[PDB]
Swiss-Prot record:
Function according to Swiss-Prot or TrEMBL: Phagocytic receptor, strong negative regulator of T-cell proliferation and IL2 production. Potent inhibitor of the alternative complement pathway convertases.
Cysteine pairs bridged by disulfides in the record: C23-C95
Lineage: Eukaryota, Metazoa, Chordata, Craniata, Vertebrata
Boundaries of every Ig-like domain copy: 3-113
UniProt protein name: V-set and immunoglobulin domain-containing protein 4
Protein encoded by which gene: VSIG4
Source superkingdom: Eukaryota
Organism: Homo sapiens
Compartments where found: Membrane
Length: 119
């Protein structure tokens, strides 16, 4: 039926190193990826830190420009790579993908993961 996001409940990354937050799905006929959003939890809101759409990749925040990259080569792999991990990077991250469906409407799916940072 619908695409299925595959996201681990938690990921451990090395302090000062790099980590991949996996977010993948098996592509399905008739479902066209139209948006990928990654968010991080701060307070009452998850805040957007990355968007990919038909105009390309968008990292609005200067603090993430140059340390945040999202997988692109393999269809269905939209894992987030975070570089030079800080203790402050420990948080819940949300991977959210939007598809156009065979019927012509849209569907959105999201999954939360926790990043822990280990010395």
């Amino acid at each position: 039926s619908r695409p299925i996001l595959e996201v681990p409940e938690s990921v451990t990354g090395p302090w000062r190193g790099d980590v991949n937050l996996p977010c993948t799905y098996d592509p399905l006929q008739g479902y066209t990826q139209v948006l990928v959003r990654w968010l991080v939890q701060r307070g009452s809101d998850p805040v957007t830190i990355f968007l990919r759409d038909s105009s390309g990749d968008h990292i609005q925040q200067a603090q993430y420009q140059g340390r945040l990259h999202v997988s692109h080569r393999v269809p269905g792999d939209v894992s987030l790579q975070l570089s030079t991990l800080e203790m402050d990077d420990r948080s819940h991250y949300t991977c959210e993908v939007t598809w156009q469906t065979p019927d012509g409407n849209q569907v959105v799916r999201d999954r939360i993961t926790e990043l822990r940072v280990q010395k």
